């Protein structure tokens, strides 16, 4: 009968730090009618061995704020990406209040809702549960504060053989304010290098190194010779360079003009994959690689780019204009193109009787001296994911973007205490995150590129409600606008 909290949504900009509070209204049904239930592919029919899974479904729900737009309004995002060279979370504050427990009775043929109980909520800060917040699932807080949202169910996959389980599988029976401290992670880079990796040279001055210009004098027999030249501004492809572009694993090139595509079903057969334990798994999104060569921007790598759906997009077999295809154009400078080879290598030893033969490199692992940019983060895209706990990993930053962590924000589980009686709950959730910023000190003379909302005339206002009250985000928003030297 007396309020347990207030309504906090706003963003403070203090110096180099940003404090973004967000509050929403939530609704928690009762999943599995207070049960734990085995699930597997066989319940769903399990036709393919690639999709074969085994696991349990639990009544609990979980709060997931893991997407950026939960914490930033499009203005705060524009304000963030335009004025900063980097950001990263510092502290996390979380509060849960205004709990309301309703009971639904059916009297005659009509339903009645009246007050009633307790609500179970706890966090797993020892990371003893499976961590499902990193898969970019749904059920996160709505981008728009006036939306009331439903809490997702919590279930976890374990070791499987086809549909069947194995002796090494585990079963987890999961049987208000707190604060959090993010572990130290590198500042996400939100700038586009002005210079390409190959052009780092001084254009006015020669190198003192020599290369092999001519292996023959002219057309004829026994014309072999060795001639050398100075590598310089006239021919820049041959200069010696200290650093080389990052790794690549090639993607198939799909074109958004459909008549250029091959007339066959190459969607699954064609696609890049990584086999594990006999289960072919698509490579998505894959290593961070540019989407296309300049001018080829109509092409996009098959599996290699985050695709977000527009507001209202159907679930299955939607057209191309119902989905928003992001593209890593900004990182083209230091990274190979996803649809192109990493280079060529010599396949044999030349001699008098044999020509020098080279061949393509389709995939290339790390070599010493490689440099690369990671994949961008978006208004929609994820914030963090938990680094798998293993003996080893390399550059743990996740492939879908964001901040890879060995101790991410804990899972927050909630369910309605059983009494059965048809019951559900609702309330308010406020999550506060402190961010830290890195200012651009650049002395670049000409004006930067900035993210601007084009002055347009249209029926509706972008990033705002339409006549029926449906908030909508028009396009995926990148974080990379300002520039820095390579």
């Amino acid at each position, epitope marked *: 009968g007396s309020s347990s909290g207030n309504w906090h949504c706003d963003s403070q900009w203090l110096g180099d730090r940003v404090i973004t509070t967000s509050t929403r209204t939530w609704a928690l049904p009762t999943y599995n009618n207070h049960l734990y239930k085995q699930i597997s592919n066989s319940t769903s029919g399990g036709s393919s061995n690639d999709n074969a899974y085994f696991g349990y479904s639990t009544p609990w729900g979980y709060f997931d704020f893991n997407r950026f737009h939960c914490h930033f309004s499009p203005r705060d995002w524009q304000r963030l990406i335009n004025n900063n060279w980097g950001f990263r979370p510092k502290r996390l504050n979380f509060k849960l209040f205004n709990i309301q427990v309703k009971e639904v009775t059916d009297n005659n043929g009509v339903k009645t809702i009246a007050n009633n109980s307790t609500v179970q909520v706890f966090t797993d800060s020892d990371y003893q549960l499976p961590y499902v917040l990193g898969s970019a699932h749904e059920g996160c807080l709505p981008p728009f504060p006036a939306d009331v949202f439903m809490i997702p169910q919590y279930g976890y996959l374990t070791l499987n053989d086809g549909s069947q389980a194995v002796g090494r599988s585990s079963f987890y029976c999961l049987e208000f304010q707190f604060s959090y401290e993010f572990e130290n992670v590198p500042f996400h880079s939100s700038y586009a290098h002005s210079q390409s990796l190959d052009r780092l040279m001084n254009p006015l001055i020669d190198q003192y190194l020599y290369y092999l210009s001519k292996t023959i004098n002219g057309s004829g027999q026994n014309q072999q010779t060795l001639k050398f030249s100075v590598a310089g501004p006239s021919n820049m492809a041959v200069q010696g360079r200290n650093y080389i572009p990052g790794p690549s694993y090639r993607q198939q090139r799909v074109s*958004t003009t459909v008549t250029q595509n091959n007339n066959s079903e190459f969607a699954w057969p064609g696609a890049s994959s990584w086999a594990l334990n006999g289960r072919n798994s698509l490579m998505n999104p894959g290593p961070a690689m540019a989407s296309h060569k*300049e*001018g080829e*921007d*109509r092409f996009f790598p098959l599996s290699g780019s985050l695709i977000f759906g527009k507001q209202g997009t159907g679930r299955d077999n939607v057209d*191309a*204009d119902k989905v928003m295809i992001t593209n890593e154009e900004e990182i083209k400078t230091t990274n190979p193109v996803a649809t192109e080879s990493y280079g060529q290598v010599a396949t044999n030893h030349q001699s008098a009787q044999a020509q020098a033969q080279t061949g393509w490199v389709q995939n290339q692992g790390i070599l010493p001296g490689m440099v690369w940019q990671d994949r961008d983060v978006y208004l929609q895209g994820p914030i963090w994911a938990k680094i798998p706990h293993t003996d080893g990993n390399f550059h743990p930053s996740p492939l879908m973007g964001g901040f890879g962590m060995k101790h991410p924000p804990p899972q927050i589980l909630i369910k309605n205490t059983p009494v059965f009686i048809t019951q559900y709950s609702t309330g308010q959730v406020s999550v506060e995150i402190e961010w830290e910023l890195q200012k651009e000190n650049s002395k670049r003379w000409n004006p930067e590129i900035q993210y*601007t909302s*084009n*002055y*347009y*005339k*249209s*029926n509706n206002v972008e990033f705002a409600v339409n006549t029926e009250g449906v908030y909508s985000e028009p396009r995926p928003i990148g974080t990379r606008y300002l520039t820095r030297n390579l």
Partner: antibody
Amino acid sequence: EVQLVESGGGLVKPGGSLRLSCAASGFMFSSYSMNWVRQAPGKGLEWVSSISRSDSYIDYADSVKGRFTISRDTAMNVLYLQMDSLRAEDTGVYYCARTHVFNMFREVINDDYYGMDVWGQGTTVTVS
Amino acid sequence: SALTQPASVSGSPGQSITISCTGTSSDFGIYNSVSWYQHHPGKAPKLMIFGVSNRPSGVSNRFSGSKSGNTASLSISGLQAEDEADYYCSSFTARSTVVFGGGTKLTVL
């Protein structure tokens, strides 16, 4: 993916009248100029008429002036060219293009012209 | 009309090609506008060059342009079989009309 699809091309005796529509999709249709061009059989492209961003300025090629009326409904993005008093020279393939401006917020009143940006495949209008 | 452009040009693969259209009075290239279009038969024409030489996002680097005095010219390099199309030049005019040249069909051998 920005697409403009022309429609309504057909066969009409001289002196008749044809209405051509251009269905715009994928972009804001009311923020751009839109205009019609014409390719006669065995000839290069020719320009017909235009309509501004706020519909204030309607322009016409000298030849078709007074015989055509360009206008856009805007309730549902579409474009309309009313062809009246057709001649034998009005045979061709009509295209629907949109002049492309990178920034719609003008900084200066006289802006250097940048040309058409998105085109349709065009429809064939034939007179007999 | 009003922009004189050669009937057809041709070149072998790999060779550069200069297509050039000329115009009369002042209004040729009034403001910055001299614009080059690529028209494949039966498909939508593309704006190869906007401005005297600026080229849009979609266009390949091979295409280029310049305007010297009264003459503007489109220069195609690294010629290929896919560059075979019709090429038109256009310029905004003082009455806020656009004017297309007759156009050059480039047949690569």
